[PDB]
């Protein structure tokens, strides 16, 4: 029985941008335990409803280690929506967002849905990346952008639901 769709999503980015909390907040875990640190992969499921239908989201969170290079391509290649995630507390994370965009373009599929996620937006006092400058990156590359806080719990649920709507609207187009 239910669900009646399955979107496969991916979280990618520099380590310590807080990719992994951003997940853990969406999937609603009560706990901190993860294998990201040690292994470099972790995974979470959440079904949501959008305009009435069940939508199973499989969310992979990748951390680059070259150790599992092959497997993590498999995730790129098979991913329906991927979130690029920087820390607004840290520039190079933001600078690299281009670099990742490479990978995504190079390792991943030709129509994939894409979303730049500016994380930790709550800690403004340590804020090196202007949002304005954030949006411009996004607009340049014609992709959606969104500022987020895994800890204040800001826009994480919206970031996903937004990406999930974007995936579905595309698929419903191929009726």
């Amino acid at each position: 029985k239910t669900y009646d769709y399955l979107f496969k999503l991916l979280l990618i980015g520099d380590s310590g941008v807080g990719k992994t909390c951003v997940l853990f907040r969406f999937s609603e875990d009560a706990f901190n335990s993860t294998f990201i640190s040690t292994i470099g992969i972790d995974f979470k499921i959440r079904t949501i409803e959008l305009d009435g239908k069940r939508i199973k989201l499989q969310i992979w969170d990748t951390a680059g280690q070259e150790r599992f290079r092959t497997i993590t391509t498999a995730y790129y290649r098979g991913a329906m929506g991927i979130m690029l995630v920087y820390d607004i507390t840290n520039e190079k994370s933001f600078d690299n967002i281009r670099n990742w965009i490479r990978n995504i373009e190079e390792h991943a599929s030709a129509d994939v849905e894409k979303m730049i996620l500016g994380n930790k937006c709550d800690v403004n006092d340590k804020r090196q990346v202007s949002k304005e400058r954030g949006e411009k990156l996004a607009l340049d590359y014609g992709i959606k952008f969104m500022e987020t806080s895994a800890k204040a719990n800001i826009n994480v649920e919206n970031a996903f639901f937004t990406l999930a709507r974007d995936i579905k609207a595309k698929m419903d187009k191929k009726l």
Binding site: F31, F35, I71, T73, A74, G78
Partner: protein, 76 residues
């Protein structure tokens, strides 16, 4: 080299053509394999967590039982 270029361009045309066909074939079984590894690992992770959670849910209410008594000792 008119019959040499009219002939060889048929070989090397078929060449890219053979591999083209060979390319879609090789990338096809890579995707197919990747999806099987996706779901295999999706399952392993799910359970791997599932277990650990229950290891923690207990450590939760045993130490929570302790703070239910440990505070009333410290209170006095």
């Amino acid at each position: 080299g008119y019959e040499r270029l009219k002939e060889e361009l048929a070989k090397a045309q078929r060449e890219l053509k053979l591999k083209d066909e060979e390319c879609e074939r090789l990338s096809k079984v890579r995707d197919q394999l990747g999806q099987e590894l996706e779901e295999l690992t999706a399952s392993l992770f799910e359970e791997a967590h599932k277990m650990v959670r229950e290891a923690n849910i207990k450590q939760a209410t045993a130490e929570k039982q302790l703070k239910e008594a440990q505070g009333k000792i410290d209170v006095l």
